[PDB]
Amino acid sequence: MSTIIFGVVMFTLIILALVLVILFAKSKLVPTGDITISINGDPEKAIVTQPGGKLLTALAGAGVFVSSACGGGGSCGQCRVKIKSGGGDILPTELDHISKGEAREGERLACQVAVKADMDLELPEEIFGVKKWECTVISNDNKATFIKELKLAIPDGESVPFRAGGYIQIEAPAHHVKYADFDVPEKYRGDWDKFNLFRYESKVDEPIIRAYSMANYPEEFGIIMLNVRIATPPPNNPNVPPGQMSSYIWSLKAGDKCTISGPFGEFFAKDTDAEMVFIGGGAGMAPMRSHIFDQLKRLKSKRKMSYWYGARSKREMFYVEDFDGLAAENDNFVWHCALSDPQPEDNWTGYTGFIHNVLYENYLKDHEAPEDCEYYMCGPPMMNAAVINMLKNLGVEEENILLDDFG
Amino acid sequence: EHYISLLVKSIFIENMALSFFLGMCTFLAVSKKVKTSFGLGIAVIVVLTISVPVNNLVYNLVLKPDALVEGVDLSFLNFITFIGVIAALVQILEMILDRFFPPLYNALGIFLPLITVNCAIFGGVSFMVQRDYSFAESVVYGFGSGVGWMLAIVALAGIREKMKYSDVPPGLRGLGITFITAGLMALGFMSFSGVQL
Amino acid sequence: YTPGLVTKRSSHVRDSVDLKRIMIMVWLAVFPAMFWGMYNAGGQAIAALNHLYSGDQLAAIVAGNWHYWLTEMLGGTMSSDAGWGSKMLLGATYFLPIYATVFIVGGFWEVLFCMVRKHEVNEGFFVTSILFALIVPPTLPLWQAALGITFGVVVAKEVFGGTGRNFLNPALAGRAFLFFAYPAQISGDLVWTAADGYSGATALSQWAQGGAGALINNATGQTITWMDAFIGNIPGSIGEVSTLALMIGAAFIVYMGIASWRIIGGVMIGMILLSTLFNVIGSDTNAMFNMPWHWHLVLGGFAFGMFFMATDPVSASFTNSGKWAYGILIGVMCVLIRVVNPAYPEGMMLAILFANLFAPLFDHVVVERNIKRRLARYGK
Amino acid sequence: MITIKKGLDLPIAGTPSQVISDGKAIKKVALLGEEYVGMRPTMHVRVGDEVKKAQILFEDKKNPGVKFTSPVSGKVVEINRGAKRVLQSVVIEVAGDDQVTFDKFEANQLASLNRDAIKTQLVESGLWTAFRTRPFSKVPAIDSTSEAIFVTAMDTNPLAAEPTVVINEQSEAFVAGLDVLSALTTGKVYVCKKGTSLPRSQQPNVEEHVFDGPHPAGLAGTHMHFLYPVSADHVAWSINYQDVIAVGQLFLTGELYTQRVVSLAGPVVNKPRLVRTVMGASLEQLVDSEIMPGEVRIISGSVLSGTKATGPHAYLGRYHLQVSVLREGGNYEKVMPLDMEPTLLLRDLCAGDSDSAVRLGALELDEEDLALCTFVCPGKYEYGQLLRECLDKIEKEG
Amino acid sequence: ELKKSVLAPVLDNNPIALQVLGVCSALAVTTKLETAFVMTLAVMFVTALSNFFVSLIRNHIPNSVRIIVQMAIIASLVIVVDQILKAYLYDISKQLSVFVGLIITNCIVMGRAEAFAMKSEPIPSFIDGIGNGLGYGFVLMTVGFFRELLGSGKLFGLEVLPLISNGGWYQPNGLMLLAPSAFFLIGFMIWAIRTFKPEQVEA
Amino acid sequence: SIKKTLFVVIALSLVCSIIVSAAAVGLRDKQKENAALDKQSKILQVAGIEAKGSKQIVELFNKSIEPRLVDFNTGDFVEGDAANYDQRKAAKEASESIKLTAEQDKAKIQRRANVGVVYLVKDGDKTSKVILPVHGNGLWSMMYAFVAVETDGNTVSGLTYYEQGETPGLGGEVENPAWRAQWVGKKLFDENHKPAIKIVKGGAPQGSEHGVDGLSGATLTSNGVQNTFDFWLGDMGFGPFLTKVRDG
């Protein structure tokens, strides 16, 4: 075996020389140890993590929690973080959700950003100040056909500190829930029995995290009101799995427990004297209620306030007694609602149609200064996309409209 | 001297991209920005200028027939040895781009590992073993081939940047038109066809 | 029902010049070369025929070629005593079918792309059709002209979005297609004169073999002087031969500001420098080394390419500094291919095509240096 | 001093006589909302309201604190709005003599005035809107400052009025205005003029710069490019000589000065000359009894850059000092004297490559700087609109 | 189970049309359908075996020297296939010719070895090599069809169009024999695929 | 980890090298025999002698082919074991080879043997044709060919390339029967006894005396073929020997 043997050693020598250069290069070019990331420049908030993984994973492990909706997909853009140094240039997908001016500041998506070298972060107090609490469900009555009001009892006492229009992230594990488990009043059971949504059974394959806006103004203590809309397959795609998080909430009743994982949100009013206009829809009645309650007793504001809720039928309408009292007690605030399809027994004699056109044909059409008004909206995308188009057609700048679409 | 002529052969006359059509996969892929294309071209020159002379010494000192011992020719260890050497440098190249990573580690992505296994790099070693180039000629040839390759890639990036005003049909947009552009580029490089040495 | 001020801030006066007028100006500029080309094409063919045949043998040849007896029918004469009318008429019988085929076939592709993609037809095809027809041998088969324009219009221009949206010269891309696809019909000794059964090397090919002493018009037996090549009384592509006719048209479009004088100046600079360099270096073996710059000017398609094809604004560099570099590269490349590339006697088409590839780079280098001056606030 | 070689002077018939005369009396005046870049108005008047000389008509939502005040006292007869309720014009019928007065100072103190005091008076009087920033040609923010204020004491627009003739009648006001600008600027005041002589400021801060050559020589963008190149972090302010006279009058008499001298010129102007009018004067009334018969076009501003004075826009623009009247019917490098590659820049604007346009010098440009390129364009592009689209994109994304 | 992976990289994830791997060999052997056919089979066979072996060692491959290890698998297999062929079936061995180097540097062999073999089970990894080579041959054979037929009048060496040089009517096209024709043909193939499978058009 | 990387690279390198080295050295001998038999097949094929199978080829090669040695510097037959002569090895040694100058090395071959084998084809007791092995460097590999020259010493009867390593489709078309068949009837020299076989890029004119179409898209391999013929037909190659053949 001449040369068969000889080639093998000469080949290995060539390979060993090549790898040795690579390994030598690795030692002198590839960082070792652990990666230290500074959070807000505070040594206490600084996290020391070994190399590898995305930034959203490492940050969650530390005491600072970063809001995220899409997760490890780089789609929502709610996990933007300020990278003073390190992390490289902004990825092309990131630019899809971050403007160049923001890039100059240093905004980056933690999930899309892979942790590979020391990085600097400047997370704010709100992201830092996330507290996990597991409230106890008090009531789970159905407010409407597909809307449920959820009342949560604080486990630590006092009340959750949050701003009006805020939200709490609700996390649930994998769990199988059947729609039949839901308890619905006869009033709302009618659409539910016609199409028999009780047949749906949900099997959440993996733990999920979602967001739910608040329905309690800050001064309210003891109960954390919330509004939940049941998730059912799309009207155009019945061949879809049913709701996973909303269905789980609906399955709960008195005595049940759920996690809120602290507060979050960027939906708030402006501390000015400008007229306020509210455009609610479906589950949007939660944040809107907090705004109206916040501006009546929390602030005792004398500024003009208007509310325009989109509902399909009287059955769909809920929280009517509270709105009527606020309008009656204080004349600065007036609420209205229009039925897109009143029932024969409703005998509604007020506004009918969509608030997209109802609000315009009643108030904004004759308004002398529609632009000089703060607008706050939360409802179905059809309602939001149409309303903003109508508001834009009135010369309302985006800076004067705040959107909190829940889908 | 003679070297300037060798450098001219490996840049224009033997342009590895537009004349020999070597390395088209990476050449037709990262060619969309002059800055990124220039970065790859610089890296390719670095890989080529180092790969070829090193393999020339290994070939003439180890793999050359009747070189290590009389009567033993380790010619059969030519492709495996060369590609491995090329692969090593690419692996190190990946590391250096970790310092200049914004422009190229992200853009090259899947192709950064592919610097090796590029028809241009392996082929240059082959010509250095098919032909008989001294070590000095190997360095001049390797640098020249890379520069000629860099000239083509940077030029295709310039053309594509100019295409910001072009209205390419969808379907041809990106790779399809790039192939047509490269065919047209090769058409104009056929000016050197009769040139000999 | 009240547009905003943006729509009203439009410049209230505009220059008379438009894209339509630019193309017609270029279209007219080649008319002198085109008309002489037809006259030269007929003249060259008639002289060769009398040199090859006579008596009833010439009559049979005239009867067996529709180009010849069609000239007889319309009032021309194929005898050597033919005047300018018969020569121009005979040359027309070759040019017009080529120009008609190129216009129709290329126009079909132009309209088809505009029709399918909802674009409006563009007038740039007038220049492409005429120039392509003027850079082919008189004997080019029509079916090859149809393919040549199809490749130039579609592959080089339309697939890039049409006029103003490509990077390569369309007419030369079409000529290159025929050059490399059917070389026998666009090279050699049988295609540059329209006398069937006649073999003659053109001046540039003859110089590469022996030199000016080989510069002979075989049909006439005389000598091809520098004056002959300059006026265009030489075999070649119909339209390229007359450097004088091209300059007359080139002067007009250059004066009108349609053709860049920086590109033309660069081409002359590149051609003069390299050809003179070859003159100084000398070559005991390569006769093309000793061709002076003024002979390079009047031979082949150098004059036509420099004036009417190197000046194609879309495929050239967009910066004044780049325009100098772009033209210089063309002149250098053309002489290089002419002198040190044995395969090709002429290199103008290939030289321009090579320069087209690098015009965006010259522009990129120039613009990046400007950006560096700006980021330094111009030292203010 | 600085000579311009690349450019074009359009030789349009009907040049003015350069003698100041009195134009037709104007009983209607308007402020044009769309003229102010990125201005979203907050209305302070309604149709039928009576207004004083320097009373606020509207405010800028995106430029807080900037007050757009009336040019004249009278009645608001309409507030024209277009698509998406864009304020087209706030028309005021001239009537009465009420005015808002302000503080007055001695001429020897204007250069020494505190900067914040100057800003307040200019903002309250509405004269703050005379300033425009060059990297976006917007009204400067109330709290912002500039190290370089450029005074355009020249007019190379076709049919333009001679600044020397106008500035000469108000020498004391012009010098007083320069002194105020001397205190207002953090750095220097550039009085960009032609070779002609002008009243001079005694402040060392005010430097006179001579520009000679064809049209682009008289543009503030041209002067900035040669004296104080501008970028995102180097912002210059622009003000024309007639607004400088207004500034001097405001700080000497304490009153808003709204008179202006504009050239009424054009092929169809029977007696092209300089006429006295008011800010925002109705051009339909201004050209009355001065135009040849036929279908003519009244242009606020020059033919190269200017507004079609039709309908809601038939009023003198804020930054326009001329009215041109016309009948209804390698080029780029030659008219661009700046250190730019004009053909490539224009290609970027056509393609919408906003970032590339920034690298090539778009930020130094206003719409008027691209007027000649538009004029000479064989493809008949309108680069002024493309530049604004790119600049708006840069502001929005940035 | 289903042949989705075997036939998907034919038209959906074609190695030369959607991705940009294997173009270099495409321009040299698509002058003939015969040469093209042997190269498609070779890339299918080598890619599938190499992808299979890399999967065996996917969990243990070091990223530092992965390419070296991956190349060793590909080069060793190509060298052995060449050596085995040279000794037995020597006539075909001449046919392999320089295709030993031309398959090793083929970006498809290494491209699929990293994209798939390194993160997949060997069995589906093997299926990936068969599938990717097939799509490589769809483009290779389609371009070979036009280039041989129009440039030579022959398909697989059998004369479909009589040549003038052989007393026929068809004049061969010289550009179809050179590299640029392949560039243009491949580009137009991409055009057809992306206009019939619009999902792939680039934004 | 340093421990895993050295172990896998060494272990993988060893297994692959053992397989590659064993396959190459072991099958090399069979490959060498198969390759030798090929040259006898090529000499017969170009000679026009149909043979089939290794045993038949050897039988027919000896019967019809008479290898002989020729001295290039003189072009005259010399005595030696022509049947067992390896010109390739001789060209590698200065004793039985010379070094060519840059000017002389038209075929780009580094060295040329002093004595080279020729093959005589004998239909009966007379040599009906002579087969000359010619080689020159190609783009990718050395190309070796056989040229069957008729007794006239001018007319070429057949051509075949028996060892090419150029890319199939482009440079491997020296093996294409149509291209080889195109040589039949061509003339190797001009009136002046100068090489006249020219490889014409783009295709030689039909019926050309010395015109063979070049390899399409393979100028460099075609250049090598021209370089092959430009040297071996020259002064230092078979030129003097063909002069003797022309007169008998």
Ligand SMILES: Cc1cc2nc3c(=O)[nH]c(=O)nc-3n(C[C@H](O)[C@H](O)[C@H](O)COP(=O)(O)OP(=O)(O)OC[C@H]3O[C@@H](n4cnc5c(N)ncnc54)[C@H](O)[C@@H]3O)c2cc1C
């Ligand atoms: C700030 C904020 C506030 C919010 N406030 C509220 C609130 O007050 N009330 C509220 O109800 N929601 C609210 N949401 C929305 C919330 O995040 C959930 O979308 C909602 O609670 C339904 O949860 P889900 O996971 O079951 O919905 P999904 O399952 O994510 O909804 C998808 C739709 O398709 C069906 N589907 C289920 N699984 C799948 C699948 N795998 N593929 C495709 N379709 C599937 C579902 O039935 C549903 O119709 C808020 C979101 C944000 C960001």
Ligand SMILES: CCCCCCCCCCCCO[C@@H]1O[C@H](CO)[C@@H](O[C@H]2O[C@H](CO)[C@@H](O)[C@H](O)[C@H]2O)[C@H](O)[C@H]1O
């Ligand atoms: C500004 C306007 C532009 C007008 C054109 C510019 C003038 C350019 C002149 C370039 C230099 C002179 O060009 C000169 O041409 C003459 C013929 O006249 C050549 O004369 C001769 O010289 C060489 C040897 O040197 C001979 O081999 C050959 O027969 C011929 O070229 C000179 O070699 C060359 O130097």
Ligand SMILES: CCCCCCCCCCCCO[C@@H]1O[C@H](CO)[C@@H](O[C@H]2O[C@H](CO)[C@@H](O)[C@H](O)[C@H]2O)[C@H](O)[C@H]1O
């Ligand atoms: C065949 C004859 C013609 C070919 C030879 C002449 C052309 C030579 C051009 C070389 C390539 C162009 O080279 C080009 O240089 C410019 C500056 O000018 C670089 O410009 C850029 O460089 C770096 C990137 O490295 C950037 O960070 C920087 O902002 C910018 O200056 C381009 O990134 C590079 O691609």
Ligand SMILES: CCCCCCCCCCCCO[C@@H]1O[C@H](CO)[C@@H](O[C@H]2O[C@H](CO)[C@@H](O)[C@H](O)[C@H]2O)[C@H](O)[C@H]1O
């Ligand atoms: C990337 C390459 C670009 C894609 C385009 C290439 C397409 C190539 C195929 C084109 C087909 C060629 O088809 C061609 O048809 C013409 C049309 O008459 C035939 O032409 C024949 O008849 C005509 C008319 O009597 C005679 O004048 C001519 O001399 C004769 O050859 C040719 O013999 C044939 O070669």
Ligand SMILES: Cc1cc2nc3c(=O)[nH]c(=O)nc-3n(C[C@H](O)[C@H](O)[C@H](O)CO)c2cc1C
């Ligand atoms: C001065 C000038 C020269 C032109 N030259 C050519 C040319 O040589 N070939 C061509 O196809 N088109 C030519 N065109 C037309 C056109 O500009 C060209 O096809 C561009 O490449 C696309 O618009 C020319 C146009 C002008 C104005």
Ligand code: FES
């Ligand atoms: S989690 Fe949605 S983009 Fe980061």
Ligand code: FES
């Ligand atoms: S570079 Fe990918 S196959 Fe050659």
Ligand SMILES: [K+]
């Ligand atoms: K030549």
